[PDB]
Design an enzyme around this catalytic site. Structure first.
Site, short mmCIF file in Angstrom:
data_model
loop_
_atom_site.label_atom_id
_atom_site.label_comp_id
_atom_site.label_asym_id
_atom_site.label_seq_id
_atom_site.Cartn_x
_atom_site.Cartn_y
_atom_site.Cartn_z
CB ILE A 92 29.34 -32.76 -1.81
CG1 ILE A 92 29.07 -31.26 -2.07
CG2 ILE A 92 27.98 -33.34 -1.67
CD1 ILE A 92 30.34 -30.79 -2.89
N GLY A 93 32.29 -33.40 -0.87
CA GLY A 93 33.78 -33.06 -1.01
C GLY A 93 34.69 -32.22 -0.33
N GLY A 136 32.05 -25.13 -1.30
CA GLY A 136 30.90 -24.27 -0.69
C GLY A 136 29.86 -24.88 -0.01
CB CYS A 137 27.15 -23.72 1.75
SG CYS A 137 27.80 -22.65 2.98
CE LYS A 168 24.38 -24.17 -5.31
NZ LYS A 168 24.95 -24.10 -6.93
CG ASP A 220 32.34 -18.86 -15.92
OD1 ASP A 220 33.36 -19.20 -16.41
OD2 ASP A 220 32.04 -18.92 -14.73
#
Ligand code: F8Y
Length: 316
Positions: A24-25, A28-29, A50, A156
């Site tokens: 995607i995009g 990361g993995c 993921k 976060d």
């Protein structure tokens, strides 16, 4: 180092079968994923997979959060009992272990979302409307109450960890539990102490003081997000390489919230609900259960002040 052969079928621990697609995009993995079928995984796929090495600490932490608090039925049960339109905790579909090239990997199947809020924010010249910010914040309050009541804090919250429902642009979801913290394991609150930091501009005073995050910290982080979203700025944004400066500013502005309103908003034209939200959070002790409904009420008073109501419209 490719973790999958594109289009391969992977079987999770509960023997559910999935097919892997493209990343995607170009984040990361993470790859598009669907139920096993004869068709290829398309660009409108409803899931993602993921994948990280099995010794990856954050993926294990995140998987544990999803298994303990984000099971499709656990969520739907909560939606009915609290009478919500939805709840922006992403659904967990399964997980397992995948070998490749003699290395062990862990994988997790999740809901696929549309765009993150940070992308939309920048495209609107780093402003969200007062309406947008209140409607986002109400839904984030629902999410934080949920995760907090399930023994976790996020630590976060920020626009890049807020994703829109792929098929519904008025529903927002909070992602990334890789450094989530179980503050209340088996109902026993952790002590005011370190554990063996979040994002500097938004993180809590507690986090700055080197103690583990708690419930008030999450609310405080949301507070700084609201000002960033409303105004495009925070006072300490030019000093983010200096944490002690950022802590000092945050401590001083917590002690004088009126001066924060003066600094961040023009004139005497500060949105009153924001100051009120900040004062309420300020009253919380480290171990104290927030009164979430009173925080939502404060935000609801803001919607009334601009001639609106909680109609669920994020207005992006
Ligand atoms: C394609 C597409 C859109 N899209 C993006 O562009 C960016 C913003 N990301 C990465 C954050 C996406 N992530 C997910 N799923 C997801 C990822 C998680 F890391 C996670 O923990 C989770 F629960 C769900 N779907 C779609 C996108």
């Amino acid at each position: 180092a490719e973790q999958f052969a594109v289009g391969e079928i992977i079987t999770d621990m509960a023997a559910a079968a999935w097919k892997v697609g493209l990343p995607i995009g170009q984040f990361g993995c993470i790859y598009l994923a669907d139920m096993n079928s004869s068709e290829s995984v398309g660009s409108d796929a409803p899931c993602v997979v993921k994948v990280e090495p099995s010794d990856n600490g954050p993926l294990f932490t995140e998987l544990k959060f999803y298994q303990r608090a984000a099971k499709p039925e656990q969520i739907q049960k909560w939606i009915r009992t609290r009478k919500l339109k939805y709840l922006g905790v992403p659904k967990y579909w399964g997980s397992g272990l995948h070998d490749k090239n003699g290395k062990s990997y862990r994988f997790m199947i999740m809901d696929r979302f549309g765009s993150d809020l940070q992308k939309i924010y920048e495209a609107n010249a780093k402003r969200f409307s007062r309406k947008t910010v209140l409607q986002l914040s109400l839904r984030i309050l629902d999410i934080l109450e949920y995760i907090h009541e399930h023994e976790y804090v996020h630590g976060d919250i920020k626009a890049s960890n807020l994703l829109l429902n792929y098929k519904n642009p008025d529903q927002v979801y909070l992602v990334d539990y890789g450094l989530a913290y179980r503050y209340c394991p088996e109902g026993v609150h952790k002590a005011y102490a370190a554990d063996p930091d979040g994002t500097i501009e938004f993180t809590s005073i507690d986090a700055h003081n080197g103690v583990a995050p708690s419930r008030r910290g999450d609310l405080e982080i949301l507070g700084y997000c609201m000002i960033q979203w409303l105004t495009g700025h925070l006072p300490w944004e030019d000093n983010l390489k200096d944490p002690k400066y950022v802590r000092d500013s945050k401590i001083r502005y917590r002690e004088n919230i009126a001066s924060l309103m003066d600094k961040c908003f023009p004139a005497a034209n500060a949105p009153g609900e924001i100051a009120k939200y900040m004062e309420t959070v300020k009253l919380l002790d480290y171990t104290e259960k927030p009164l979430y409904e009173n925080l939502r009420d404060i935000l609801l008073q803001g919607l009334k002040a601009i001639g609106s109501k909680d109609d669920g419209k994020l207005d992006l």
